[PDB]
Design a protein around this ligand. Structure first.
Ligand SMILES: [Ca+2]
Length: 314
DNA sequence: GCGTCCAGGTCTACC
DNA sequence: GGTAGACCTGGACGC
């Protein structure tokens, strides 16, 4: 009863709600879609993970988002803590207004948007976002998820345990920059990305001026930010865009991976015009990004998140 | 069963 | 400057 992952029906007095209609948010379409790799549906329709340095379980009804926190006597989430959740899901942004606009200027989006409502963008921590996506290149979401979990268990702060799952906070720069981290990560199956994680932690700490350098990027311009990130090992045009869009508040950033290329080709009959090659290249990828930006506008990256999520369901 | 594919790409030797 | 290839892993086919 007081053990294991909570459920809305099993410990009612431990949940607090936040007004939020399904049309504004669909947990099942956001949490496992490759934005954040730290959420698990431990129980049907209930997603658990670390949010703002503590564990949470989230589940929704038709007009409500139910939340519960595991911190020392058990109690319902406080208003201050609930605000942590609203900020994570950027709930002040009305998804209905965005869908309307995108739908109005792109009939294909309108068709897809009718079946995939509630796909919004999470506002993530720069450090977690940087290393999680460094782990995502040339990989699949299922594998990435495992790697990130083993990376946190091995180098992140131990939080609390529910059933047989021990939650860990995301590793710090100092820890990822530690001795023999690469070798450890390789044994944890991160492949060549193990070097990228170690190498990027050190560059940030020993060459770019630590954490402050990364955090300052949120006030910098998309152009500047993306430019700054490409310096880090394991970070290319796509990873940089992922971070700008999901962790640095650059809503116009559009990541271009294999999924978005296929979408461009079959759903818009798109082809490079300024670019030389007829396939993916640093030049064509950059062009595809501008194409999407001129199609959807300022929040083009968010529209991208919708089609990407929808393309995963196939 | 085994070899080839691929997945939210990067990085590098080279024409 | 604008490419071809190599690359850790492991669930997916194709045969
Ligand atoms: Ca590929």
């Amino acid at each position: 009863g007081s053990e294991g992952h909570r459920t809305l029906a099993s410990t009612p007095a431990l949940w607090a709600s936040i007004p939020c209609p399904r049309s504004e948010l669909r947990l099942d379409l956001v949490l496992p879609s490759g934005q954040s790799f730290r959420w698990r549906e431990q129980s049907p329709a209930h997603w658990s993970g670390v949010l703002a340095d503590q564990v949470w379980t989230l589940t929704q009804t038709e007009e409500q988002l139910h939340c519960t926190v595991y911190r020392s006597q058990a109690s319902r989430p406080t208003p201050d803590e609930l605000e942590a959740v609203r900020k994570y899901f950027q709930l002040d942004v009305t998804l209905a207004q965005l869908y309307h606009h995108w739908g109005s200027v792109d009939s294909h989006f309108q068709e897809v948007a009718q079946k995939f409502q509630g796909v919004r963008l999470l506002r993530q921590d720069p450090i977690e976002c940087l290393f999680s996506f460094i782990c995502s290149s040339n990989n699949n979401i299922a594998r990435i998820t495992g790697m990130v979990e083993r990376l946190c268990q091995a180098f992140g702060p131990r939080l609390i345990q529910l059933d047989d799952v021990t939650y860990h906070g995301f590793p710090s720069l100092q820890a990822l920059a530690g001795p023999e981290v690469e070798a450890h990560l390789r044994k944890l199956g991160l492949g060549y990305r193990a070097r990228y994680v170690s190498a990027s932690a050190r560059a940030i700490l020993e060459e770019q001026g630590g954490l402050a350098w990364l955090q300052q990027l949120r006030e910098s311009s998309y152009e500047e930010a993306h430019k700054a990130l490409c310096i880090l090992p394991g970070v290319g045009t796509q990873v940089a865009d992922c971070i700008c869009l999901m962790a640095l508040d650059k809503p116009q950033a559009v990541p271009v991976d294999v999924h978005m290329w296929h979408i461009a080709q079959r759903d818009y009959s798109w082809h490079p015009t300024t670019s030389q090659a007829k396939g993916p290249s640093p030049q064509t990828n950059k062009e595809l990004g501008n194409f999407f930006r001129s199609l959807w506008g300022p929040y083009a990256g968010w529209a991208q998140a919708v089609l990407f999520s929808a393309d995963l369901r196939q």
